[PDB]
Amino acid sequence: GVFKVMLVGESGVGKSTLAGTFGGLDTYERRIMVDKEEVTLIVYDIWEQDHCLQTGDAFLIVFSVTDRRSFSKVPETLLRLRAGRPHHDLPVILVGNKSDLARSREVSLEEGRHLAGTLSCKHIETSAALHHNTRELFEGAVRQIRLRR
Numbered sequence: 001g002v003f004k005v006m007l008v009g010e011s012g013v014g015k016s017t018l019a020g021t022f023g024g025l026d027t028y029e030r031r032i033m034v035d036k037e038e039v040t041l042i043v044y045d046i047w048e049q050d051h052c053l054q055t056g057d058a059f060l061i062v063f064s065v066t067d068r069r070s071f072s073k074v075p076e077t078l079l080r081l082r083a084g085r086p087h088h089d090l091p092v093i094l095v096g097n098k099s100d101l102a103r104s105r106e107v108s109l110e111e112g113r114h115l116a117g118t119l120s121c122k123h124i125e126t127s128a129a130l131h132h133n134t135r136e137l138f139e140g141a142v143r144q145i146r147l148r149r
């Protein structure tokens with residue numbers, strides 16, 4: 001029961017901060033409880049601007065809601081990941097991070113959801129800074145990976 005979740009996306013969106021919420025005080029491992037069953041979750045924060053793609057069980061494509069450029073890069077990023085394992089139904093979620101910065105937002109909630117719906121991904125918004133929805137993010141990953149097994 002081992003789950004490998006890869007954080008990927010443009011520089012500055014919050015990948016390391018997201019990993020930090022899971023790992024506390026570039027790979028983090030913990031046994032967590034999801035749906036009454038314990039599992040080993042390893043969160044990878046080794047994406048650079050590969051080993052990542054083959055290794056992963058799930059891919060969290062992180063963009064920042066305050067960085068429209070990072071959002072525009074999502075389609076081409078997802079395409080490359082999927083193309084590297086064309087036979088696999090990869091669990092993927094688009095993670096709109098920095099939701100706490102309301103007065104700096106460059107990407108809307110509904111836009112994120114439309115993108116995820118169009119590309120057949122999951123979608124969630126997080127604040128890695130305040131641990132808003134970060135637990136839900138990683139637990140959700142475990143659930144989708146389970147469906148692939």
Ligand SMILES: Nc1nc2c(ncn2[C@@H]2O[C@H](COP(=O)(O)OP(=O)(O)NP(=O)(O)O)[C@@H](O)[C@H]2O)c(=O)[nH]1
Nearest residue numbers: 010011012013014015016017097098099127128129
């Ligand atoms: N307000 C706010 N700031 C955030 C949030 N997540 C990350 N940040 C801030 O955004 C900056 C970049 O975070 P970081 O996790 O380093 O991003 P990264 O994607 O790992 N960068 P890189 O790809 O270059 O390693 C940091 O200054 C961090 O404190 C968030 O949810 N809210």
Ligand SMILES: [Mg+2]
Nearest residue numbers: 015016017045
């Ligand atoms: Mg980083």
